[PDB]
Symmetry: none
């Protein structure tokens, strides 16, 4: 029910469908709020692994101190914790796909811990003495410029080229004008339902404006703008005037 229109955005859809079967690293890039999360969620859904669990993690929100332990896991006892052994996030995602959003904001110290893990697909639980092997597809996302961080010495060069084997860029909305209106309508359906309103669609006078506003917040800002409009709506349609106070 989602929207893929325009020559630019439709082209990406083909790329994704072909790599659905692949076991190899993925690097997703673009501004935040362009729909990168949907794509990340989509690759898993379209893959040979569609029925398995999808584990969402906000990286960098993990403290550096428990990062390795909280991720890879630990056994019973073994450096003053609990009594019983506890699974790590990788083993829970074993056979599945793990999505790390905003990887580019990760600390230099933490990257090194997962670094050796990337190539071997093997690791040691903290305090565990038996090497474990798991099968996990890695997905990554960031709203920032990764190319820059490497040049600034803020990002390891070797990690970029390992994850950046395949790189998929999402362009902003201002470079996809054809996609604007169909999306706006999709949100109307959702918001009209939520707040139980009588709204149907937008007047043409309103529609012309969206194209001239170069949308710095992309999809994420739009979704918010519509939600505002539906709430203050009176009739079933929204005029340019109701947007004017919004802009």
């Amino acid at each position: 029910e989602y929207v893929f229109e325009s020559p630019k955005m439709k082209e990406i859809l083909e790329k994704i469908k072909k790599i659905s079967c692949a076991e190899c690293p993925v690097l997703i890039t673009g501004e935040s709020g362009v729909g990168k999360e949907v794509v990340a969620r989509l690759i898993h859904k379209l893959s040979d692994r569609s029925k398995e669990p999808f584990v969402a993690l906000n990286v960098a929100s993990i403290p550096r101190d428990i990062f390795e332990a909280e991720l890879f896991g630990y056994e019973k006892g073994a450096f003053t914790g609990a009594v019983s052994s506890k699974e790590g996030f990788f083993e829970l995602a074993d056979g599945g796909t793990l999505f790390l959003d905003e990887i580019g904001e990760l600390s230099l110290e933490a990257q090194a811990k997962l670094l050796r893990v990337i190539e071997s697909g093997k690791f040691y639980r903290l305090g565990g003495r038996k090497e474990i092997e798991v099968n996990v597809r890695i997905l990554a996302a960031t709203n920032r410029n990764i190319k820059e961080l490497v040049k600034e010495g803020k990002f390891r060069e070797d990690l970029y080229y390992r994850l950046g084997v395949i790189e998929i860029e999402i362009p902003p909305l201002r470079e996809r004008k054809e996609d604007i209106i169909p999306l706006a309508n999709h949100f109307l359906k959702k918001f009209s339902r939520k707040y139980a309103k009588e709204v149907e669609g937008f007047t043409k006078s309103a529609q012309e404006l969206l194209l001239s506003y170069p949308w710095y917040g992309n999809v994420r800002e739009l979704k918010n703008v519509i939600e505002r409009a539906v709430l203050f709506s009176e009739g079933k349609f929204i005029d340019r005037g109701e947007l004017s106070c919004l802009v």
Copy 2:
């Protein structure tokens, strides 16, 4: 109890009643001491959740070390934490409202931690392997210009669009002259009673001064000036002369 007399403020008064039913995040701006907290607490009382918990947080007062742990919560066995597991502030506010005050003073590193939590209402407990989802309405406030801070790279662009579903600016007092006297009189009533004094109201010449002093501290300054005035009053009324030493 609460005072709104003004063109500017009455417009806002209407705005709140419509989102009383709304489930989405709110971002309040204005100088500090214009009543941002009153607005935040009021939305809750006027909403359908008015009977549920309301959690007030300074968020600048939170220590960096426990920031992650004290917020989301943890399961027993996170690097020798306690014995027992403890819920987080998000879980405590479930069904209720969570207010993050003076958010604009937060460091970029910390802002990012909150990213996945706001929109999805989902997160992971520390040491927990089970994804938790809770229902909490989020309000935020700051006394600085956040739109400018983003442009200066001092505040995350992606976080702004998550909280900024609704944006409400509070105008200063000098742009609300009609609010001055009602506010001034209301504060006097409580203080005269509290400190058991004989004071009732203001002389005409005194009232004229309040209108001419362009109030840089806004409403918060007013309350104090009356409190200063009430304590030193002799007769039942306050003249312009008694204010002269205060201004």
Copy 3:
């Protein structure tokens, strides 16, 4: 046992007596050694709260790391913190008065933490989920000019309006000529007693020069100068010569 002889100090002394019933924060300013500390104790003794605890604190002296914990207090578990629950200085002063000297030396980042505590008198213990409310009258003092610093952006504007309910400035010593001699005798009386000397009073020639001194160190400097002078005293009276080497 305290000395107030002067037009300047007697006027202020009256103000203190009038606010004895008031429950609100006070801001003391002045050069170092002018008695800013004395007033803070005096307000307490003359107020209705005079019989309850008076807590003296160098706020600048609080290390940043435990700054939050030592102030608000904490529950048992805090990253292997203690065993037992412990109250903070705000809770310790409940029903009493809390005196923060050198408020002006705090970093902008740290000041932000104190905001909700000052006005609401409310906070959350560390690891505690129940909002606590305390009753504390706040007294503050600083050797800096706050009105200037705010304009220089070196001090939070919003915090000033929270603490600044009552503002007391106080003049240096050179602008109080009447206090010099009465004070000098008290210290001489004190030190002659302490150090068992034969000294009684001052020669006429000595006294005239002393009054014409700029006194950058104010009363504290006097106390030191008398202590220095008494030790080297020979006769029962002190001449201009023993003081002359200091000026």
Copy 4:
């Protein structure tokens, strides 16, 4: 075993004996190696506390992170302060004398922490709820020009007036010619004893040179020069030639 043959140092010696009874802080200044430590160590021996504790401290050797803790002391709790409670240096010096060497090397921010402690002799232990009071004589030393530092804003004026009750200036060695030879013989005595040598005294020509030698390092340099000579000595006396080589 200490040497004072100079007119200036003899006057100071008298000055010291008169102030032996005082309980108040002393500030010693001068070039390094002029004997600032012997005087400080001596005053204790001549005071009423000569049998009481003498605490020697390099305030510069205290690391920034525990500066607060190592000084005031701490209770089991607080930091993750492990298990045992520990006294602070101030509690250690109660009834005794506290010697702070190289006070002049403190960072302006750090100076402020000890401020209330110096004058009041009062503080709170870390995690402690009972105010502790001690009676401590404070001694301080610096190799820097302190009068200058205040004027440049590099040293707080407020601390100076707390510490600066008694100020003792030690002149360099080049301004005490009378002290040179008596000192030299004493140093000759010790090293001749330690290294079991045959040396007795100086040639007439050599002694003259020492007097014309602008000692920049003062006594500390002399001691070293003597130590070199005793080691390399052959006969019972040292000629100008043995010194000519140095340097």
Copy 5:
């Protein structure tokens, strides 16, 4: 065979120079001395060797010799690893721990690359160097230890003092005895004996047939103003032996090295 290993006779060492011969004698005089020593010179001149030697000829030769790169100590634990620390006062460890100073008690302490220290860091050592006294971190008992200090730097230290880049008061604590090591280019006599010594060592390890140098080669070595000094030589000789074929080395083999 590899790098003796039972070291009967010997690692030995070469001193044939007038300057170095004079310095060797000076050392013999301080064998009884308990006082700090300051060694200066270009890099690779044997400053470490002298330091190890002063220890060997002293009365403390049988007691501990603590070798330390001070520059390598982290700023954060610098105070702690040095003076030592008690059970608390950090979030450090559990148990109390001795410092390197307390470890060298009765012995000799060698501080290498002292000249690279930051002014903030130098000030901390003051009471410890001259008085030999300090307080352990979190400790309330004043500790007193007996330690002879040796120091080294590859820079000009008097210069640093005059430039305000090195604390003056500290200089007079360490600088009781000061030893300036001249470079090799000012010791011409040491050149040939050294090269021969290195050649023999490497010939054994890497089993080659080389014995000595041609007359033409020796001339070049003398005209090479050795900016890396002996350390450069040791490397240069080691380089030649591996690539050596016959028993002698000509000037041609050196040209690619210089």
Copy 6:
């Protein structure tokens, strides 16, 4: 299985064969991605220690805070953190060979710490009082010309003399014409195998681009472009079109 064709690449292999017995540090120079690690990795395989461990490390990438700890290792405690004892990379490489990558990108300050370690192979564990001694062969790499860099004061002169015994450069690619083609095919074999593809070899049209030289990223770019090309391959042979699409 490594590819050496060009005369430059073939001659160097012979040089190594002679020094296989040598135990001394090595200095490798050339552009990034020229095979410095492979040359280095081969040397180990050819050495007397070839059967012992080989430790690869990027030095410039280590964070300053843990730089010392991860390198020398540490005993339990002696740090704020670190429950567990840790071997260092030096001790981990004991009896083996240690490869330091991108030394030329290392901070000047960090270089000074390594001095005694390189030549003497001795150090003290962090918090350990027992001296550690190891037998380790040194390998070094840089993307810059070091002899020049020292003269610019960007690299310590004394450290160079430790690593710079033998200096061997490598041409990037452009002076090796013969190595280009054999390499590309070698990867096709692995990548066709790894991802189970139908690919066999390259068409003549593909090769024409390969002969169009300008590889600014040298060999490192090649491996990635081929890895990229194989995934996007359609037929059993690859035309210029999938390669043309990148650069």
